[PDB]
Coordinates of C-alpha atoms in Angstrom, one line a residue:
Chain A
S1 CA -8.3 -11.7 -9.3
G2 CA -5.4 -11.2 -6.8
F3 CA -5.5 -9.8 -3.3
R4 CA -3.1 -7.2 -1.8
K5 CA -3.0 -4.9 1.1
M6 CA -4.2 -1.8 -0.7
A7 CA -4.3 1.8 0.5
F8 CA -6.7 4.6 -0.6
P9 CA -5.1 6.9 -3.2
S10 CA -3.3 9.6 -1.2
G11 CA -3.6 12.7 -3.5
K12 CA -6.5 14.4 -1.6
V13 CA -4.4 14.2 1.6
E14 CA -1.1 15.2 -0.1
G15 CA -2.6 18.6 -0.9
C16 CA -3.3 19.2 2.8
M17 CA 0.2 18.5 4.2
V18 CA 2.3 21.3 5.8
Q19 CA 5.3 21.8 8.1
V20 CA 4.9 23.3 11.6
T21 CA 7.8 24.6 13.7
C22 CA 8.0 26.0 17.2
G23 CA 11.4 26.7 18.7
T24 CA 13.6 24.1 16.9
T25 CA 11.0 21.3 16.9
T26 CA 9.5 20.6 13.5
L27 CA 6.7 18.1 12.5
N28 CA 3.8 17.7 10.1
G29 CA 0.5 19.5 10.1
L30 CA -2.8 19.1 8.4
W31 CA -4.2 22.2 6.6
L32 CA -7.9 22.3 5.9
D33 CA -9.5 25.5 4.7
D34 CA -8.0 28.2 7.0
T35 CA -6.8 25.9 9.9
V36 CA -3.7 23.8 10.5
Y37 CA -3.9 20.8 12.9
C38 CA -0.8 19.3 14.6
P39 CA 0.4 17.4 17.7
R40 CA 0.5 19.9 20.6
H41 CA 3.8 18.4 21.7
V42 CA 5.4 20.6 19.0
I43 CA 5.6 23.2 21.8
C44 CA 7.7 21.0 24.2
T45 CA 11.3 22.0 25.2
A46 CA 14.3 19.7 25.6
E47 CA 13.3 19.0 29.3
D48 CA 9.5 19.7 29.1
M49 CA 9.4 16.2 27.5
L50 CA 9.1 14.5 30.9
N51 CA 6.4 16.5 32.7
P52 CA 5.1 19.2 30.4
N53 CA 2.2 21.4 31.5
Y54 CA 0.7 22.2 28.1
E55 CA -1.6 25.1 29.4
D56 CA 1.4 26.8 30.9
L57 CA 3.7 26.2 27.9
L58 CA 1.1 27.5 25.4
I59 CA 0.1 30.7 27.3
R60 CA 3.8 31.7 26.8
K61 CA 3.4 31.7 23.0
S62 CA 1.8 34.1 20.5
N63 CA 0.6 33.6 17.0
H64 CA 4.1 34.5 15.7
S65 CA 5.8 31.8 17.8
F66 CA 4.6 29.4 15.1
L67 CA 6.1 29.0 11.6
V68 CA 3.8 27.1 9.3
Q69 CA 5.1 26.4 5.8
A70 CA 3.4 25.0 2.7
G71 CA 6.5 23.8 0.9
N72 CA 8.9 26.7 1.2
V73 CA 6.0 29.2 1.5
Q74 CA 5.2 30.6 5.0
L75 CA 1.5 30.8 6.1
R76 CA 1.0 33.4 8.8
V77 CA -0.7 32.3 12.0
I78 CA -3.6 34.6 13.0
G79 CA -4.9 32.6 16.0
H80 CA -4.4 29.5 18.0
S81 CA -6.1 27.1 20.4
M82 CA -5.5 23.7 22.0
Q83 CA -8.1 21.0 21.6
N84 CA -7.2 18.0 23.8
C85 CA -3.8 16.8 22.5
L86 CA -3.8 18.9 19.2
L87 CA -3.2 22.5 18.3
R88 CA -5.5 24.3 15.9
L89 CA -3.6 27.1 14.2
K90 CA -5.7 29.6 12.1
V91 CA -3.8 31.0 9.2
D92 CA -4.4 34.0 6.9
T93 CA -4.8 31.8 3.7
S94 CA -7.2 29.0 2.8
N95 CA -6.2 25.8 1.2
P96 CA -7.9 25.5 -2.2
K97 CA -7.0 21.8 -2.4
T98 CA -9.1 21.1 0.8
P99 CA -11.2 18.1 -0.1
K100 CA -14.7 17.3 1.1
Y101 CA -13.8 15.8 4.6
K102 CA -15.2 14.6 7.9
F103 CA -13.5 13.8 11.2
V104 CA -14.2 10.2 12.6
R105 CA -13.1 8.3 15.6
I106 CA -12.7 4.6 14.5
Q107 CA -13.1 1.4 16.5
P108 CA -10.2 -1.0 17.0
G109 CA -10.1 -3.7 14.2
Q110 CA -10.9 -1.0 11.6
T111 CA -8.4 -0.3 8.8
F112 CA -7.1 2.9 7.3
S113 CA -4.3 4.3 5.1
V114 CA -1.4 6.3 6.5
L115 CA 0.4 9.0 4.4
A116 CA 3.9 9.0 6.1
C117 CA 5.4 12.5 5.8
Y118 CA 8.6 14.3 7.1
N119 CA 9.0 18.1 7.1
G120 CA 5.6 18.5 5.5
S121 CA 6.4 16.3 2.5
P122 CA 4.9 12.9 1.6
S123 CA 7.2 9.9 1.8
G124 CA 4.9 6.9 1.2
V125 CA 1.4 5.4 1.7
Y126 CA 0.5 2.2 3.5
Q127 CA -2.6 0.4 4.8
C128 CA -2.9 -0.8 8.4
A129 CA -5.4 -1.9 11.1
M130 CA -5.9 -0.3 14.5
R131 CA -5.1 -3.1 16.9
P132 CA -7.7 -4.2 19.4
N133 CA -5.3 -2.5 22.0
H134 CA -5.5 0.7 20.0
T135 CA -1.8 0.8 18.9
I136 CA -0.8 0.7 15.2
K137 CA 2.0 -1.6 13.9
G138 CA 3.2 1.3 11.6
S139 CA 6.4 2.4 9.8
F140 CA 7.3 5.8 11.3
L141 CA 10.8 7.5 11.8
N142 CA 11.7 10.6 13.9
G143 CA 9.8 13.7 12.5
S144 CA 6.8 11.6 11.2
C145 CA 4.6 13.1 13.9
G146 CA 1.5 14.8 12.5
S147 CA 1.1 12.3 9.6
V148 CA -2.5 11.2 9.3
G149 CA -4.6 8.1 8.9
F150 CA -7.6 8.2 6.7
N151 CA -10.3 6.4 4.6
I152 CA -12.1 7.8 1.4
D153 CA -15.7 7.2 0.5
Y154 CA -16.4 8.4 -3.0
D155 CA -14.8 11.8 -2.9
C156 CA -15.0 12.4 0.9
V157 CA -11.9 12.0 3.1
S158 CA -12.6 10.7 6.6
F159 CA -9.6 11.6 8.7
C160 CA -9.3 9.1 11.6
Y161 CA -5.8 9.3 13.0
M162 CA -2.9 11.7 13.7
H163 CA 0.5 10.3 14.7
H164 CA 1.9 11.4 18.0
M165 CA 4.4 8.8 19.4
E166 CA 6.2 5.5 19.4
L167 CA 6.1 3.0 22.4
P168 CA 9.0 0.8 23.7
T169 CA 7.9 -2.2 21.6
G170 CA 8.2 -0.1 18.5
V171 CA 4.4 0.2 17.8
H172 CA 2.7 3.5 17.4
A173 CA 0.1 5.6 19.3
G174 CA -1.9 8.7 18.3
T175 CA -5.2 10.6 18.4
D176 CA -8.3 11.2 16.5
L177 CA -8.8 14.5 14.9
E178 CA -10.4 16.0 18.0
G179 CA -7.0 15.3 19.7
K180 CA -8.2 12.4 21.9
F181 CA -5.8 9.4 22.2
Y182 CA -6.6 6.0 21.0
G183 CA -5.8 3.8 24.0
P184 CA -4.7 4.7 27.5
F185 CA -1.7 6.9 26.4
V186 CA -0.5 10.5 27.1
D187 CA 1.8 12.8 25.2
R188 CA 4.8 12.8 27.5
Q189 CA 8.0 10.7 27.7
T190 CA 7.0 8.3 30.5
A191 CA 7.0 4.6 31.3
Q192 CA 3.9 3.7 29.1
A193 CA 3.5 0.4 27.4
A194 CA 1.1 -1.2 24.8
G195 CA -1.6 -3.3 26.5
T196 CA -2.5 -7.0 25.7
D197 CA -3.6 -7.4 22.2
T198 CA -5.7 -10.1 20.4
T199 CA -6.0 -11.2 16.7
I200 CA -9.0 -9.5 14.9
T201 CA -11.2 -12.5 14.5
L202 CA -13.8 -10.7 12.3
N203 CA -11.1 -9.7 9.8
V204 CA -9.5 -13.3 9.6
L205 CA -13.0 -14.7 8.7
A206 CA -13.4 -11.9 6.1
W207 CA -10.1 -12.8 4.5
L208 CA -11.0 -16.5 4.5
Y209 CA -14.1 -15.4 2.6
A210 CA -11.9 -13.4 0.2
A211 CA -9.9 -16.6 -0.5
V212 CA -13.1 -18.5 -1.4
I213 CA -14.3 -15.7 -3.8
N214 CA -11.0 -15.8 -5.4
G215 CA -11.4 -19.5 -6.1
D216 CA -9.7 -21.3 -3.2
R217 CA -11.6 -23.8 -0.8
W218 CA -8.9 -26.2 0.5
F219 CA -9.3 -25.2 4.2
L220 CA -13.1 -25.7 4.4
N221 CA -14.5 -28.8 6.2
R222 CA -17.8 -30.8 6.7
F223 CA -18.4 -29.4 10.2
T224 CA -20.3 -26.6 11.8
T225 CA -19.9 -25.0 15.3
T226 CA -21.9 -23.0 17.7
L227 CA -20.7 -19.4 18.3
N228 CA -19.9 -20.5 21.8
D229 CA -17.9 -23.5 20.9
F230 CA -15.9 -21.5 18.4
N231 CA -15.0 -18.9 21.1
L232 CA -14.0 -21.7 23.5
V233 CA -11.3 -22.7 21.0
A234 CA -10.3 -19.4 19.4
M235 CA -9.9 -17.6 22.7
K236 CA -7.2 -20.2 23.5
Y237 CA -5.2 -18.8 20.5
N238 CA -5.4 -15.2 21.7
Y239 CA -8.3 -14.4 19.2
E240 CA -10.8 -11.6 20.0
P241 CA -14.2 -13.0 21.1
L242 CA -16.7 -13.1 18.1
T243 CA -20.1 -11.8 18.9
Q244 CA -23.5 -12.1 17.0
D245 CA -23.0 -8.6 15.7
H246 CA -19.7 -9.7 14.0
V247 CA -21.5 -12.8 12.6
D248 CA -24.2 -10.4 11.2
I249 CA -21.5 -8.2 9.5
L250 CA -20.4 -11.3 7.6
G251 CA -23.9 -11.9 6.0
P252 CA -23.1 -10.4 2.6
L253 CA -19.9 -12.4 2.2
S254 CA -21.7 -15.5 3.4
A255 CA -24.4 -15.0 0.7
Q256 CA -21.9 -14.4 -2.1
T257 CA -20.0 -17.6 -1.4
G258 CA -22.8 -19.9 -0.1
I259 CA -20.8 -20.6 3.0
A260 CA -22.6 -20.1 6.3
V261 CA -20.7 -18.0 8.9
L262 CA -20.6 -20.7 11.5
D263 CA -19.4 -23.2 8.8
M264 CA -16.5 -20.7 8.1
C265 CA -15.9 -20.5 11.9
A266 CA -15.7 -24.4 11.9
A267 CA -12.9 -24.0 9.1
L268 CA -11.0 -21.5 11.2
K269 CA -11.3 -23.6 14.4
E270 CA -9.6 -26.5 12.4
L271 CA -6.8 -24.2 11.0
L272 CA -6.1 -23.0 14.5
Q273 CA -6.1 -26.6 16.0
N274 CA -4.2 -28.2 13.1
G275 CA -2.2 -25.5 11.4
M276 CA -1.9 -24.9 7.7
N277 CA 0.4 -28.0 7.1
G278 CA 2.8 -25.9 4.9
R279 CA -0.1 -24.7 2.6
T280 CA -1.0 -21.0 1.8
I281 CA -4.1 -19.0 1.6
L282 CA -4.1 -16.0 -0.8
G283 CA -0.3 -16.6 -0.8
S284 CA 0.1 -16.2 2.9
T285 CA 1.5 -18.8 5.3
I286 CA -0.3 -17.3 8.3
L287 CA -3.8 -16.1 9.0
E288 CA -4.1 -12.4 8.0
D289 CA -6.2 -10.0 10.2
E290 CA -5.7 -6.5 8.5
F291 CA -8.7 -6.7 6.0
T292 CA -12.3 -5.9 7.3
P293 CA -15.4 -7.4 5.6
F294 CA -15.8 -4.0 4.0
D295 CA -12.3 -4.2 2.6
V296 CA -12.9 -7.6 1.1
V297 CA -16.2 -6.5 -0.5
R298 CA -14.4 -3.4 -2.0
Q299 CA -11.5 -5.3 -3.4
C300 CA -12.9 -8.7 -4.6
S301 CA -15.2 -9.4 -7.5
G302 CA -19.0 -9.4 -6.7
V303 CA -18.9 -12.8 -8.6
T304 CA -17.4 -15.9 -6.9
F305 CA -15.0 -18.0 -8.9
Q306 CA -17.0 -21.3 -8.4
Chain B
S1 CA 10.6 1.7 13.7
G2 CA 8.3 -0.9 12.1
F3 CA 8.6 -1.9 8.4
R4 CA 5.8 -1.8 5.9
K5 CA 5.4 -2.4 2.2
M6 CA 5.0 1.3 1.3
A7 CA 3.6 2.6 -2.0
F8 CA 4.7 6.0 -3.5
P9 CA 2.2 8.8 -2.7
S10 CA -0.2 8.5 -5.8
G11 CA -1.4 12.2 -6.1
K12 CA 0.7 13.1 -9.1
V13 CA -0.7 10.0 -11.0
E14 CA -4.3 10.4 -9.9
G15 CA -4.3 13.8 -11.6
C16 CA -3.6 12.0 -14.9
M17 CA -6.4 9.2 -14.9
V18 CA -9.3 9.5 -17.4
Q19 CA -12.0 7.2 -18.7
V20 CA -11.9 6.0 -22.4
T21 CA -15.0 4.5 -24.0
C22 CA -15.4 2.9 -27.4
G23 CA -19.0 1.8 -28.0
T24 CA -19.6 -0.6 -25.1
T25 CA -16.0 -1.0 -23.9
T26 CA -14.8 1.3 -21.1
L27 CA -11.3 1.4 -19.6
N28 CA -8.8 3.8 -18.2
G29 CA -6.3 6.2 -19.9
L30 CA -3.3 8.2 -18.9
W31 CA -3.6 11.9 -19.8
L32 CA -0.2 13.7 -20.2
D33 CA 0.0 17.1 -21.8
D34 CA -2.4 16.7 -24.9
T35 CA -2.1 12.9 -25.3
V36 CA -4.2 10.1 -23.7
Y37 CA -2.5 6.7 -23.7
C38 CA -4.6 3.5 -23.3
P39 CA -4.7 -0.2 -24.2
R40 CA -5.4 -0.7 -27.9
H41 CA -8.1 -3.3 -27.0
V42 CA -10.5 -0.5 -26.1
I43 CA -11.5 -0.5 -29.8
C44 CA -12.7 -4.2 -29.4
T45 CA -16.5 -5.1 -29.3
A46 CA -18.4 -6.9 -26.5
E47 CA -17.4 -10.3 -27.9
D48 CA -15.0 -9.6 -30.9
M49 CA -12.0 -10.2 -28.5
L50 CA -10.3 -13.4 -29.6
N51 CA -7.8 -12.7 -32.5
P52 CA -8.8 -9.2 -33.7
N53 CA -6.9 -7.5 -36.5
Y54 CA -6.2 -4.2 -34.7
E55 CA -4.9 -2.3 -37.8
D56 CA -8.0 -3.2 -39.7
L57 CA -10.3 -2.3 -36.8
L58 CA -8.6 1.1 -36.3
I59 CA -9.1 1.9 -39.9
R60 CA -12.9 2.2 -39.2
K61 CA -12.5 4.3 -36.0
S62 CA -12.9 8.0 -36.3
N63 CA -11.8 10.6 -33.6
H64 CA -15.4 11.2 -32.6
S65 CA -16.1 7.5 -31.6
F66 CA -13.5 7.8 -28.8
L67 CA -15.3 9.2 -25.8
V68 CA -12.7 10.5 -23.2
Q69 CA -13.9 11.9 -19.9
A70 CA -11.8 13.6 -17.3
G71 CA -14.1 13.6 -14.2
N72 CA -17.2 15.2 -15.7
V73 CA -15.4 17.1 -18.4
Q74 CA -15.5 15.7 -22.0
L75 CA -12.1 15.8 -23.8
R76 CA -12.5 16.0 -27.5
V77 CA -10.2 13.6 -29.5
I78 CA -8.6 15.4 -32.5
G79 CA -6.1 12.7 -33.5
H80 CA -5.4 9.0 -33.0
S81 CA -2.7 6.4 -33.7
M82 CA -1.6 3.0 -32.5
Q83 CA 1.9 2.4 -31.1
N84 CA 2.5 -1.3 -30.5
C85 CA -0.3 -2.4 -28.1
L86 CA -1.4 1.2 -27.1
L87 CA -3.5 4.0 -28.6
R88 CA -2.3 7.6 -28.4
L89 CA -5.3 9.8 -28.5
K90 CA -4.6 13.5 -29.2
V91 CA -7.0 15.7 -27.3
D92 CA -7.8 19.4 -27.5
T93 CA -6.7 20.1 -23.9
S94 CA -3.3 19.8 -22.4
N95 CA -3.6 18.2 -18.9
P96 CA -3.0 21.1 -16.3
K97 CA -2.1 18.4 -13.7
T98 CA 0.7 17.0 -15.9
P99 CA 3.7 16.2 -13.5
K100 CA 7.3 16.0 -14.5
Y101 CA 7.5 12.5 -16.0
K102 CA 9.5 9.8 -17.9
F103 CA 8.6 6.6 -19.6
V104 CA 10.9 3.7 -18.4
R105 CA 11.0 0.0 -19.0
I106 CA 11.3 -1.8 -15.6
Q107 CA 13.6 -4.9 -15.3
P108 CA 12.6 -8.2 -13.7
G109 CA 12.7 -8.1 -9.9
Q110 CA 12.3 -4.3 -9.7
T111 CA 9.2 -2.9 -7.8
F112 CA 6.7 -0.1 -8.5
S113 CA 3.4 1.2 -7.2
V114 CA 0.1 0.5 -9.0
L115 CA -2.8 2.9 -9.0
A116 CA -5.8 0.7 -9.5
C117 CA -8.5 2.5 -11.4
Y118 CA -12.1 1.9 -12.6
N119 CA -14.2 4.2 -14.9
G120 CA -11.3 6.7 -14.8
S121 CA -11.6 7.0 -11.0
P122 CA -8.7 5.9 -8.9
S123 CA -9.6 3.1 -6.4
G124 CA -6.5 2.0 -4.5
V125 CA -2.7 2.0 -4.5
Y126 CA -0.4 -1.0 -3.8
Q127 CA 3.3 -1.9 -4.3
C128 CA 4.4 -4.9 -6.4
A129 CA 7.4 -6.4 -8.1
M130 CA 7.9 -7.4 -11.7
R131 CA 8.3 -11.2 -11.2
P132 CA 11.2 -13.1 -12.8
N133 CA 8.5 -14.8 -15.0
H134 CA 7.4 -11.3 -16.3
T135 CA 4.0 -11.2 -14.6
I136 CA 2.9 -9.1 -11.6
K137 CA 0.9 -10.5 -8.7
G138 CA -1.6 -7.7 -8.7
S139 CA -5.1 -7.2 -7.7
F140 CA -7.3 -6.2 -10.6
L141 CA -11.0 -6.6 -11.6
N142 CA -12.8 -6.2 -14.9
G143 CA -12.6 -2.5 -15.9
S144 CA -9.0 -2.0 -14.5
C145 CA -7.3 -2.1 -17.8
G146 CA -5.2 1.0 -18.5
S147 CA -4.3 1.4 -14.7
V148 CA -0.7 2.3 -14.5
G149 CA 2.5 1.4 -12.4
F150 CA 5.1 4.0 -11.6
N151 CA 8.0 5.1 -9.4
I152 CA 8.9 8.6 -8.3
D153 CA 12.4 10.1 -8.2
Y154 CA 12.3 13.6 -6.4
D155 CA 9.6 15.4 -8.4
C156 CA 9.6 13.1 -11.5
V157 CA 7.1 10.3 -12.1
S158 CA 8.6 7.3 -14.0
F159 CA 5.7 5.4 -15.6
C160 CA 6.7 1.8 -16.2
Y161 CA 3.5 -0.3 -16.5
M162 CA 0.1 -0.2 -18.1
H163 CA -2.3 -3.0 -17.3
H164 CA -3.8 -5.1 -20.2
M165 CA -4.8 -8.6 -18.9
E166 CA -5.2 -11.4 -16.5
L167 CA -3.6 -14.9 -17.0
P168 CA -5.3 -18.2 -16.0
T169 CA -3.4 -18.4 -12.7
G170 CA -4.8 -14.9 -11.8
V171 CA -1.5 -13.1 -12.3
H172 CA -1.3 -10.0 -14.6
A173 CA 0.4 -8.9 -17.8
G174 CA 0.8 -5.6 -19.5
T175 CA 3.1 -3.2 -21.3
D176 CA 5.4 -0.5 -20.9
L177 CA 4.4 3.1 -21.9
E178 CA 5.6 2.4 -25.5
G179 CA 3.0 -0.4 -25.6
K180 CA 5.5 -3.3 -25.6
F181 CA 4.6 -6.3 -23.4
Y182 CA 6.7 -7.5 -20.5
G183 CA 7.3 -11.2 -21.3
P184 CA 6.0 -13.2 -24.3
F185 CA 2.3 -12.3 -23.9
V186 CA -0.1 -10.8 -26.5
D187 CA -3.3 -8.8 -26.2
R188 CA -5.6 -11.4 -27.6
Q189 CA -7.3 -14.4 -26.1
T190 CA -5.0 -17.4 -26.8
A191 CA -3.5 -20.1 -24.7
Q192 CA -0.8 -18.2 -23.0
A193 CA 0.5 -19.1 -19.5
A194 CA 2.9 -17.8 -17.0
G195 CA 6.2 -19.7 -16.9
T196 CA 7.4 -21.0 -13.5
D197 CA 8.5 -18.2 -11.2
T198 CA 11.4 -17.9 -8.8
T199 CA 12.2 -16.0 -5.6
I200 CA 14.0 -12.7 -6.2
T201 CA 17.3 -13.3 -4.3
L202 CA 18.5 -9.7 -4.9
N203 CA 15.5 -8.4 -2.9
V204 CA 15.6 -11.0 -0.1
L205 CA 19.2 -9.9 0.5
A206 CA 18.2 -6.2 0.5
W207 CA 15.5 -6.8 3.0
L208 CA 17.9 -8.8 5.3
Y209 CA 20.2 -5.7 5.2
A210 CA 17.1 -3.6 6.1
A211 CA 16.5 -5.9 9.1
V212 CA 20.1 -5.4 10.2
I213 CA 19.8 -1.6 9.8
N214 CA 16.7 -1.8 12.0
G215 CA 18.4 -3.8 14.8
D216 CA 17.1 -7.3 13.9
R217 CA 20.3 -9.3 13.2
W218 CA 20.0 -12.6 15.1
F219 CA 20.5 -14.5 11.8
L220 CA 24.0 -13.2 11.1
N221 CA 27.0 -15.6 11.6
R222 CA 30.8 -15.5 11.5
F223 CA 31.1 -17.4 8.2
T224 CA 31.2 -16.7 4.5
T225 CA 30.4 -18.6 1.2
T226 CA 31.6 -18.6 -2.4
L227 CA 29.0 -17.4 -5.0
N228 CA 29.0 -20.8 -6.5
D229 CA 28.2 -22.6 -3.2
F230 CA 25.5 -20.1 -2.5
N231 CA 23.9 -20.6 -5.9
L232 CA 23.9 -24.4 -5.5
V233 CA 21.9 -24.0 -2.2
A234 CA 19.6 -21.1 -3.5
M235 CA 18.8 -23.0 -6.6
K236 CA 17.4 -25.9 -4.5
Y237 CA 15.0 -23.5 -2.8
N238 CA 13.8 -22.1 -6.2
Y239 CA 15.7 -18.8 -5.7
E240 CA 17.1 -16.9 -8.7
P241 CA 21.0 -17.3 -9.1
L242 CA 22.9 -14.4 -7.7
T243 CA 25.3 -12.8 -10.1
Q244 CA 28.3 -10.5 -9.6
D245 CA 26.2 -7.7 -10.9
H246 CA 23.6 -8.2 -8.1
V247 CA 26.5 -8.4 -5.6
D248 CA 27.5 -4.9 -6.8
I249 CA 24.0 -3.5 -6.7
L250 CA 24.0 -4.4 -2.9
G251 CA 27.3 -2.4 -2.4
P252 CA 25.8 0.7 -0.8
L253 CA 23.8 -1.5 1.7
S254 CA 26.9 -3.7 2.3
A255 CA 29.2 -0.6 2.9
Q256 CA 26.6 1.0 5.3
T257 CA 26.4 -2.1 7.5
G258 CA 30.0 -3.4 7.0
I259 CA 28.6 -6.8 6.1
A260 CA 30.1 -8.2 2.8
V261 CA 27.4 -9.6 0.5
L262 CA 28.9 -13.1 0.6
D263 CA 28.8 -13.0 4.4
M264 CA 25.1 -12.1 4.1
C265 CA 24.6 -15.0 1.7
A266 CA 26.1 -17.3 4.3
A267 CA 23.4 -16.0 6.7
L268 CA 20.8 -16.5 4.0
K269 CA 22.0 -20.1 3.3
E270 CA 21.5 -21.1 7.0
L271 CA 18.1 -19.5 7.0
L272 CA 17.0 -21.5 4.0
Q273 CA 18.5 -24.8 5.3
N274 CA 17.2 -24.4 9.0
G275 CA 14.2 -22.0 8.8
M276 CA 13.7 -19.4 11.5
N277 CA 13.0 -21.6 14.6
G278 CA 9.9 -19.6 15.3
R279 CA 11.7 -16.2 15.2
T280 CA 10.6 -13.2 13.1
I281 CA 12.7 -10.8 10.9
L282 CA 11.2 -7.3 10.6
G283 CA 8.0 -8.8 12.0
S284 CA 7.8 -11.5 9.2
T285 CA 7.9 -15.3 9.6
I286 CA 8.9 -15.6 5.8
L287 CA 11.7 -14.1 3.6
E288 CA 10.2 -11.1 1.8
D289 CA 11.2 -10.6 -1.9
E290 CA 9.3 -7.5 -2.9
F291 CA 11.7 -4.8 -1.5
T292 CA 14.5 -3.7 -3.8
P293 CA 17.9 -2.4 -2.5
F294 CA 16.4 1.1 -3.6
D295 CA 13.2 0.6 -1.6
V296 CA 15.3 -0.2 1.4
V297 CA 17.1 3.1 1.5
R298 CA 13.9 5.1 0.8
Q299 CA 12.1 3.5 3.7
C300 CA 15.0 3.5 6.2
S301 CA 16.1 7.1 5.5
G302 CA 12.7 8.9 5.2
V303 CA 13.2 10.1 1.6
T304 CA 10.3 12.4 0.6
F305 CA 8.9 13.6 -2.7
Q306 CA 8.0 17.2 -3.8

């Protein structure tokens, strides 16, 4: 029993973290086999911040412009290239702690763990969702750039996120591991702002299912709803539209609890319209949207507390 | 910017998790140098689990009946003993992944990270507090016993918790690394129940300092309170009484911000009496109590671990 925002264990990623320095800018890098990945903005000067041309900045560097360190030990750079918004630095040693890994580009509403690092050393781990608008509501300070977001399936690390920047509202923006930004952002200091965001409806339903599996039913009701009528209400409360595919994803949680998806939507509709009347669900006073159906199935018993 | 509940990076602990099996019972052990620590109730049988005589049962256990697996490696048990509610199993291989470590007994209200584990395989990591009622609000399923809680101080892991059991309200109970329970609980199946709990005032104050450090201060006012007046109010709201010792523990945060603890208490008092009027503090609509004054510094200042 219990339910808490849980991260994947961070050890497989800890053994890949390095420091990368170019000029006097330093940030984190990710060292897999014989390559180090980091935000390309490591090469930006004091002014270059505003309008950098990265092709032009990079052609002016050699392999020895880059100081990569694993702890206090320097790894020599024997090649370099730019891939979208990342650098790929080849080094003359391989990382024997390299785990089995993939690179994946995740969809908004999906969750992942972030190992926050500074100067190539781990500070902490936390679990978050990519917002529907592609920003992350993270906890990052100056120098956290290059920390990575990931999930782990059995012993395989799926890297999904690299941190590049912070926006004026204090949310965070970054790239996948091919260097392409999540959301309509660029790596320069300009007037950029997070887009409109919505609540992740699929995840709020999943979490109401988690509360049932864990024994709680107070918020259910005797009603059903059509998918359409549910959206007509929920879209008034800034919720993401729910599609039939999202209904289908909830099938296994539905079967485990004996509550039909549209009956759970009818419950949600009521919570939205009436509020929680000072009650809690899984100890929360608000509706939580940072657990996917997959997270709920991984964390909760396969046996409902009836 | 942003504020998250952050766990310690878990890598140093993952390298210590093993699986321990006795007949049909499987749980987790902690492998440090040539000793494996685990809950003494691993020697119990599929149903022999209410009121066992552990001393009598251990009599009939030989070394060879303990099966200890580290990944796919078998670790041969060459010695065993009971220490309070733990077994210490001597094995023939000293753990090459042993970190610098200490065993410490955590005090009520202090936090730690939990590495949830099943079949000796780490599953997830989350942060919790030791509640004033001596339970933790964890997230644990059958097979999690022997999962451990810890803190890190530079390069040194302080182990402070080993999981033994779930209580009827779905909170959790366990021991320190000398096998002595936190609270009045026992490792048998009796009627035992969590006492009433209270909000950890020391941590609520710490987190309000963190809010101020982060620029969120709207709740500050020009007034002060006495400790006695503050406790009369806090006690109405089911908050732990604030002592002079807690006032001193908040000294560094108070010095950093120039806000005397009793001035922060006068802020807190108005919050409890009037609520937040729809405003947030560090993104929350509630007063968070699972961040210690020590957590606050580590998150605000980017402390790392080597």
